[PDB]
Amino acid sequence: SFFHGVTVTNVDIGARTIALPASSVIGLCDVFTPGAQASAKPNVPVLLTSKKDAAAAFGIGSSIYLACEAIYNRAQAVIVAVGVETAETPEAQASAVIGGISAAGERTGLQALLDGKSRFNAQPRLLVAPGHSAQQAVATAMDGLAEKLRAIAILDGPNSTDEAAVAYAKNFGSKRLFMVDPGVQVWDSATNAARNAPASAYAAGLFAWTDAEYGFWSSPSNKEIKGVTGTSRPVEFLDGDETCRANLLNNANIATIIRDDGYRLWGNRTLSSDSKWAFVTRVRTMDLVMDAILAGHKWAVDRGITKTYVKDVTEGLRAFMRDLKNQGAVINFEVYADPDLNSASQLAQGKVYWNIRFTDVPPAENPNFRVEVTDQWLTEVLD
Amino acid sequence: DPDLNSASQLAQGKVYWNIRFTDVPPAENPNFRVEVTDQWLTEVLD
Amino acid sequence: MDAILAGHKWAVDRGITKTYVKDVTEGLRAFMRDLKNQGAVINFEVYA
Amino acid sequence: SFFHGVTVTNVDIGARTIALPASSVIGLCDVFTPGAQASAKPNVPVLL
Amino acid sequence: LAEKLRAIAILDGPNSTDEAAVAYAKNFGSKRLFMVDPGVQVWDSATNAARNAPASAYAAGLFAWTDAEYGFWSSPSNKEIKGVTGTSRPVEFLDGDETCRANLLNNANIATIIRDDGYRLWGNRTLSSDSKWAFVTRVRTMDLV
Amino acid sequence: TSKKDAAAAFGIGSSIYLACEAIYNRAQAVIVAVGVETAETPEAQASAVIGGISAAGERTGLQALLDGKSRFNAQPRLLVAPGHSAQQAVATAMDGLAEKLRAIAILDGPNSTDEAAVAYAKNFGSKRLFMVDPGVQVWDSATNAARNAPASAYAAGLFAWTDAEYGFWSSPSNKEIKGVTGTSRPVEFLDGDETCRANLLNNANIATIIRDDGYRLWGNRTLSSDSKWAFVTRVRTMDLVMDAILAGHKWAVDRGITKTYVKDVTEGLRAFMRDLKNQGAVINFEVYA
Amino acid sequence: MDAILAGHKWAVDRGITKTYVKDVTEGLRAFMRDLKNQGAVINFEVYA
């Protein structure tokens, strides 16, 4: 007979919803002085949320707090900060910043950011290392680490001059590097006077402002930065001419703070050879929708690949991408199951493909205006 | 089956029915070939 | 020229959505029309 | 089984964009008098 | 015995390490074998503390849950198991990479309990040489019809 | 599998860990590492690296990699021996071993100069050898300063990045390598001219890291005389589909060779190769009896 | 010339699939067309 009663099986099918995780969590790693007021341990990752949670953690005056304060002053954001004890020589200090792994097995230094995901559920999708980035060594660690986190490591090249900034950017070429050359100077509270900063954390907090406001898909450039009071090496910028020096650095894929004091930062060009990923925007949107689809369809995995299931996942992308379109994240999209890929043998191994394709919105970094007079509408002056 | 069900096979009681189908395999690895482009850019115009 | 140059300094790198194009297009529509009725120009035409 | 999870490979294909570099950068080489006010060295290239 | 009953014998290889689990699966190759390596640990009531289990019965009851719910044709993998509190030898599993160790055991046709505590079990590959009967599902539907 | 599993295994500061870390920093991958104790003299140390067989019977040294298949189900299809490859001795062992594993042994010739690199490559000529001459320098954590590396493991991890990303069929060259900070003997490279020195080494079948710091590696030419197997790509795809068909049709073997069976195997290749075609592994194929 | 040279530095050694050829072909199509409407060239033609 089998059962013989009255069943009520819940058919668990339908297009699941998908979200945009992480969005813009900052992954900082400067230095401080562990002791009394410093609640945070000399190396482990610590989650932040506001200046209060950061102050009692690392302490006031700590070089790391001047970086966190620079971010929170700009725009509030999650900062899975690490922080490492200051070393003797400046060179060997970069070792603790990069961090090998230690005998304890726990990832030390900058590499500790990989733990931020499996501890705080906040994958730092925006690396930054104020002060420690002009060095060729630590800069590559930021590059390699960014690909693990699908983040955008914001470097900060040495001031000195422009020649030294271009020669520095010529080294890298990865999608996930957004360097800023001119070191903005902030008014330090402890020194009670001018004080040059790496301009790394300021550019990082600046992103968090646009990401929380407009969106991650919005370009950060041409947005004013707060907590400033001048800029080391005044990068010139005319009203509208390619002759200005602010432009020449952008050709070498470099961000710069223009005008007096610190009016605004721009230079969307990420240190990338491939012109496809020229904008930092594209890298930021693509790394997001990828991590979303990855972490989103974790419910599916091994499950009955019936015609319903394919449509449930297909409609899952239809609705998802359409929530990005009307939101303005993308201009237009198209998702479907490829006939050629989805072969009878591929499905028999569990493989099932969905060709997603779209156009992330590029920032109009140079809108032209071909204005030109004529003598056309002159006969109109008659009748 | 025409070939199996021979005049001699049925005369021994043997009678065959060729059943065939495809049991549902679990999608143990669904891929997502996502890729941006510059196709739908001219759409931003009219 | 100097007006359009110094005028659209707010735009620059920004999401080039269909709205943005129209926002700038309508920015010139209204602008030039303020020159037309004012008598600065006889007639104009702006578009992408 | 191979992997057994949920991949999301980024297919890096499509027509890349191309620009017009350099355009018209001048390469001058006259003479001068190096000393005090002359910041530029007596021979090395200096950008202007 | 499984071939006499057309069943699916769920084994449970030794913990110790992964090397010992792969070398153990290399022995068998029958359609009707679905081994699970990492021995999940349950909270025994009598001992009033942690206690390692063979993870065999847990994987068995797990099938009965999916079979009664979705159906025998439904795959058991990627379904959360209850009555757990940790897993002997924490088998690592990244968000999405073949480099993770949870995947390597599945290549050797082995089921594993991933994530902390005992989030879920997976590894549809039955200890079978013939790739036609690679999934435990096919063996379960065919033996039924 | 990761730095954690490698750190507790060999230890920090170990010359082997600097090689594994160089790979995992680039792109995560499975490494059936061996590792051998350091010897007295550098010459006799290569013996332990090559490894005879020992009285125990168990394959020692570099030859121990043959056991990686029948223990971890992970046949090392990508050999590498950082530091120990400039020596003519150990280099041949990498050549002979690669054919047993159908792998691609990545050598690393001596720096010094370019003349010494060309004269070194002139010795080998096997399909399964992909040498890189200029020794990239990494910033060692222990030394807290510059430190020259063999650039062998970096080029190895670089493959694993492309193989996991694009595919094994994708060429590794022209892909940027991380965990660098300069390159011993700056190999020059112009914008576009055969006069550049980076090109001349590629003519001698040599990989090189171009531009400042360590922008990228290229030189697809494997140290092979036969122009048919000139690219490292072809050797990498062919050694794969072969091992796939070999290990794939293990179910067949002695079985009734009826017309159905032939078609079952024929259609097995039809569907299989077509999964490589649409995937982009191959342009087109053709299989039949 | 210097644009095409420095422009297609992203390509180089890469899978020469039918897609790749079209990706580069369409790269020149769009590129030259940006020169045509701009007035840099009267007309063009690019192909394999």
- Cα separation, F157 vs F175, in Å, equals 11
Nearest to D14 by CA among A274, A147, E4: A274
Here the tokens at position A354 are 């969905």
Contact E58, E5 (CB under 8 A): no
- Cα separation, F139 vs F146, in Å, equals 5
Distance of CA E25 to the CA centre of its chain: 12
DSSP A60: T
Which residues from chain B sit within 8 angstroms of residue A352, using beta carbons? 27, 29-31
Alpha-helical regions (H) of A188-306:
200-213, 245-251, 280-296
Query: How many CB atoms sit inside 10 A of residue G19's CB?
Result: 13
Residues linked to residue E42 through DSSP beta bridges, in sequence order: E51
- Cα separation, A373 vs C2, in Å, equals 15
Q: What is the CA radius of gyration of chain B?
A: 28
At what resolution in Å was this solved? 3.9
Is A371 buried (19+), middle (13-18) or exposed (0-12) by CB count in 10 A?
Answer: exposed
Helix or strand holding residue A331 (H, E): strand A330-336
SS3 content of chain B, % helix, strand, coil (to 5): 5, 15, 80
Residues linked to residue A85 through DSSP beta bridges, in sequence order: A32
CB–CB contacts below 8 A, A to G: 6
Contact A140, F176 (CB under 8 A): no
Give residues with Cβ within 8 angstroms of A43, minimum separation 6: A82, A83, A84, A85, A99, A108, A109, A112
Q: Cα distance from A347 to chain B (closest Cα, Å)? A: 7
Nearest by CB to residue D2, choosing from E96, E107, E124, is E107
Q: What is the CA radius of gyration of chain A?
A: 25
Contact F218, F196 (CB under 8 A): no
| Chain F residue nearest residue E24, CA to CA | F71
Contact E144, B31 (CB under 8 A): no
Widest CA span in chain E: 46
CB contact under 8 A, A273 and G7: no
Residues linked to residue A363 through DSSP beta bridges, in sequence order: C15
- Cα separation, A188 vs A205, in Å, equals 18
The vertex-A198 CA angle with A226 and A33, nearest 5°, equals 105
CB contact under 8 A, F218 and G15: no
- Cα separation, A316 vs A354, in Å, equals 11
- Cα separation, A310 vs B32, in Å, equals 12
| Chain F residue nearest residue G6, CA to CA | F191
| Chain C residue nearest residue A379, CA to CA | C42
CB contact under 8 A, F191 and G5: yes
Contact A305, B25 (CB under 8 A): yes
Give residues with Cβ within 8 angstroms of A370, minimum separation 6: none
CB contact under 8 A, F139 and A345: no
Here the tokens at position E136 are 């435990």
Nearest by CB to residue C17, choosing from A239, A361, A369, is A361
Contact E125, E109 (CB under 8 A): yes
Chains C and E touch (3+ CB pairs under 8 A): no
Alpha-carbon distance values, F188 to F134, F155, F199 (Å): 11, 19, 9
Give residues with Cβ within 8 angstroms of A39, minimum separation 6: A56, A57
Query: How many CB atoms sit inside 10 A of residue A191's CB?
Result: 9
Residues linked to residue E41 through DSSP beta bridges, in sequence order: E52
User: E19-57 burial by CB neighbour count: b if 16+ within 10 A, else e?
Assistant: eebbbbbeebeebbbbbbbbbbbbeeeeeeeeeebbbbe
Helix or strand holding residue A317 (H, E): helix A307-325
Nearest by CB to residue D15, choosing from B30, B31, B38, is B38
Does residue D12 belong to the interface with chain F, where contact is any CB pair within 8 Å?
yes
Is A259 buried (19+), middle (13-18) or exposed (0-12) by CB count in 10 A?
Answer: middle
CB contact under 8 A, D1 and E96: no
Here the tokens at position A369 are 């205006």
Long-range contacts of A139-143, Cβ-Cβ distance < 8 Å, separation of 24 or more: A139/A171, A139/A172, A140/A172, A140/F139, A140/F178, A140/F179, A140/F180, A140/F181, A140/F213, A141/A98, A141/A110, A141/A111, A141/F25, A141/F179, A142/A110, A142/A177, A143/A172, A143/A174, A143/A176, A143/A177, A143/F178
Helix or strand holding residue A196 (H, E): strand A193-196
DSSP F32: -
Contact A185, A228 (CB under 8 A): yes
Q: What is the CA radius of gyration of chain C?
A: 12
Neighbouring chains to E with at least 3 Cβ pairs closer than 8 Å: A, B, D, F
Here the tokens at position G1 are 């010339």
Alpha-carbon distance values, E28 to A76, E13, E108, F71, G31 (Å): 58, 12, 11, 15, 61
**Separate counts of helices (H) and strands (E) for chain C:** 2, 0
Here the tokens at position F265 are 């195997």
- Cα separation, A355 vs A333, in Å, equals 11
- Cα separation, C37 vs D7, in Å, equals 61
**D-interface mutation test, from E75, E106, E124, most D Cβ less than 10 A away:** E106
Q: Ramachandran region of residue A121, left (φ > 0), alpha (ψ -120 to 50) or beta?
A: left
Strands E120-122 and F208-210: unpaired
- Cα separation, F107 vs F130, in Å, equals 6
CB contact under 8 A, E95 and A303: no
**F-interface mutation test, from E95, E99, E101, E107, most F Cβ less than 10 A away:** E99
Alpha-carbon distance values, C9 to A21, E8, F164 (Å): 33, 71, 44
Distance of CA F288 to the CA centre of its chain: 33
- Cα separation, E6 vs B12, in Å, equals 29
Q: Cα distance from F239 to chain E (closest Cα, Å)? A: 20
Nearest to F18 by CA among F42, F30, F35: F35
DSSP-based three-state secondary structure for A71: helix
Contact A103, F12 (CB under 8 A): yes
Alpha-helical regions (H) of chain F:
3-10, 17-26, 42-50, 69-72, 88-101, 114-121, 152-165, 197-203, 232-248, 259-277
- Cα separation, E83 vs E58, in Å, equals 8
Here the tokens at position A374 are 């004529």
Helix or strand holding residue A356 (H, E): strand A355-360
Alpha-helical regions (H) of F145-227:
152-165, 197-203
Which residues from chain G sit within 8 angstroms of residue A276, using beta carbons? 10
CB contact under 8 A, F144 and A92: yes
DSSP-based three-state secondary structure for F221: strand
Q: Cα distance from F1 to chain D (closest Cα, Å)? A: 14
Nearest to A92 by CA among B11, E24, D17, F140: F140
Q: Cα distance from D40 to chain G (closest Cα, Å)? A: 30
Chains E and G touch (3+ CB pairs under 8 A): no
Q: Can you give the length of chain B in residues?
A: 46
- Cα separation, A84 vs A96, in Å, equals 7
Please name the residues between 121 and 180 in chain F that touch chain G, using a CB distance below 8 Å: 166, 169-171, 173-174
First to last CA, chain A: 95
Give residues with Cβ within 8 angstroms of E81, minimum separation 6: E40, E58, E59, E61, E62, E113, E118, E120, E121
CB contact under 8 A, B31 and A309: no
Helix or strand holding residue G32 (H, E): helix G18-36
DSSP sequence for A150-173: T--BB-----S-HHHHHHHHTT--
Which residues from chain B sit within 8 angstroms of residue D11, using beta carbons? 33-35
- Cα separation, E91 vs F94, in Å, equals 33
Is C1 buried (19+), middle (13-18) or exposed (0-12) by CB count in 10 A?
Answer: exposed
Does residue F181 belong to the interface with chain A, where contact is any CB pair within 8 Å?
yes
Does residue F28 belong to the interface with chain E, where contact is any CB pair within 8 Å?
yes
Q: Cα distance from G43 to chain A (closest Cα, Å)? A: 21
Which residues from chain C sit within 8 angstroms of residue A222, using beta carbons? 12-14
Nearest by CB to residue B28, choosing from E124, E141, E142, is E124
Amino acid at A308: T
Residue in the structure block whose two tokens are 């194929």:
F285
Which residues from chain E sit within 8 angstroms of residue F68, using beta carbons? none
DSSP sequence for A89-123: SHHHHHHHHH---TTT-SPPGGGGGGGSHHHHS--
Contact F27, F157 (CB under 8 A): yes
Residues linked to residue A81 through DSSP beta bridges, in sequence order: A46
DSSP sequence for chain E: -HHHHT--B------S-HHHHHHHHTT---SSB--B-S-BEEEETTTTEEEE--SHHHHHHHHHHHHHHT-TTS--SSB---S-S-BSS-----SS-TTSHHHHHHHTS-BEEETTTT-EEE--B-S-SSGGG-BHHHHHHHTT-
Is F43 buried (19+), middle (13-18) or exposed (0-12) by CB count in 10 A?
Answer: exposed
Here the tokens at position F83 are 């530091």
User: A212-251 burial by CB neighbour count: b if 16+ within 10 A, else e?
Assistant: eeebbbbbbbbbebebbeebbeebebeeeeeeebbbbbbe
Query: How many CB atoms sit inside 10 A of residue A194's CB?
Result: 12
Alpha-helical regions (H) of A214-244:
none
Here the tokens at position G6 are 């420095």
Q: Can you give the length of chain C in residues?
A: 48
**A-interface mutation test, from C2, C10, C13, C31, most A Cβ less than 10 A away:** C13
Q: What are phi and psi of A32, to 5 degrees?
A: -160, -170
Here the tokens at position F109 are 């010739």
- Cα separation, F197 vs F218, in Å, equals 13
Which residues from chain E sit within 8 angstroms of residue A287, using beta carbons? none
SS3 content of chain C, % helix, strand, coil (to 5): 50, 0, 45
Residues linked to residue A180 through DSSP beta bridges, in sequence order: A255
Q: Cα distance from E57 to chain F (closest Cα, Å)? A: 27
Strands A31-32 and A84-85: parallel
First to last CA, chain D: 62
CB contact under 8 A, B45 and C16: no
Residues linked to residue A193 through DSSP beta bridges, in sequence order: A188
- Cα separation, F26 vs F153, in Å, equals 10
Q: Can you give the length of chain A in residues?
A: 383
Which residues from chain B sit within 8 angstroms of residue A313, using beta carbons? 30
Nearest to A111 by CA among A147, A87, A145: A145
Please name the residues between 212 and 241 in chain F that touch chain G, using a CB distance below 8 Å: 218, 220
First to last CA, chain G: 17
| Chain A residue nearest residue D14, CA to CA | A276
